[PDB]
Amino acid sequence: MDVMNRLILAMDLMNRDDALRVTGEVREYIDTVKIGYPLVLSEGMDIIAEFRKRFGCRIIADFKVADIPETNEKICRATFKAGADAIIVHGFPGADSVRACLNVAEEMGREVFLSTEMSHPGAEMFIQGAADEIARMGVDLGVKNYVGPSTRPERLSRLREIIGQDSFLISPGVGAQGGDPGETLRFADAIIVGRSIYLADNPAAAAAGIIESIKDLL
Template structure:
């Protein structure tokens, strides 16, 4: 099986459910992404447990957006729990992002997938791309719901910086389209974790991506 480019967004509250879904789908995933709902519902230790159960990288999607010291305090505990990557907002400035990057691999949000992103974040995207090119994070977040924006962001980024795209499935994005637009990794949440058969849903999306790649 080729290396996966699929990331599971595990936006559930319950520890047991999260571990079960992650274990059942792990074969088709590159990484598991945890967000505030799961951390609030199950505690920070869920990062450690998911890593043990799946053997996969864990992305902590905290979208850190605070002063450097607060970002540093939060990121320190999250990396300590076993997270491999932490997602941070870039709009708070380079020093806040660097505070996270000094502790571990970081992914910067340059544009979000929901319609409201057009109000304030999209107008700042060019500046956020410049910030990413300057700092050299592992990757950036770009919207799978707007493949043309993914293509634009990819064209402006340094080639070694990965493009990671949420919004496939429930939000309307198509895995095939976004990979063709230049995405390195595709994030899928509800289409997998609310499915009656999460493993089969993950397999289907994995195969869709593999065909394009």
Template structure:
């Protein structure tokens, strides 16, 4: 239910010790998401290091958004680090872009997760106008999952209605961006992506545990 986003800066007591965060939150997390801030600071090898430090899935979040050949080339570098999944934008469309990425990902045994909407307000003006098409394209492509915002649970409900149980839904926006643990899960998400509420805590393990407990309480109440 919980995917931890490892974006620096971390809590001052942790400095840059992302492996300590991985170790401490591992019992409560079902995956880790590593994005540009950590990769740019520590190099792409950071993905391999985190891959070694946990048995949980590692998701490379570069929000790929390019022509297919370029995304496929980036994917090869990420696959060498052993990542389990990559995140790509859905607004780029399928032909000549996502189709090529998905084809390459299948060969390399890496899952693709497509951003169908984002958690910030500006998403409403552009991406959100095409959520239905992005979700339907993703379903046709047979990708592993979608990113939809915890800050707008109605979009999660819409997407879940379209994909049924076929795709996993990952939902950021919990904690610092305003949604509460469980909001997205109760709307139909499979995982909530949580970063700062955990990684800026002096005790990331305890913070992750608190998020997970709150998620479980909420899910028990809303799903019965």
């Protein structure tokens, strides 16, 4: 995946008008948008096709897929039917649950991103201790796309080590959660940024500013 400016917008506004307006305001800076349940549950799955129609951007569906294999398969089918290019899946529920998602993605020409270690404090309780193993599991399963934590660059670096330089790694927790864009891009291919852009008085200027700060990395 080739992400413009190494910057993925996390569009977690919950109103269609605002989400479309803000995305439009930063469209010159990005070609990849992560849409999650805050927007989808508020406005419907049709929002994905609307983003494709208006912006042509890639859409990563951040659905943290975390069920049994049979249910995971159904979730992935519904998500790809709506036009998502990729889906984010949890590894904590185990290999069969991940494989179910990989199968549907292959069938529909899409990508699975595996969440390895989350960026919030609670991730320390259970996720962090399993994260290296979840990454190795991804490698064993042939997962090529991973998500790791901007808030812990030492952990992000370890995850990069496990998956290798050929795998694609994206990283949320930049800005609002405390992560630094440039430091994160030492290890991740792209950063995910939500609030620092979409809650800014001037989202375009916020996006521009982040990009300016990492210009030598582009």
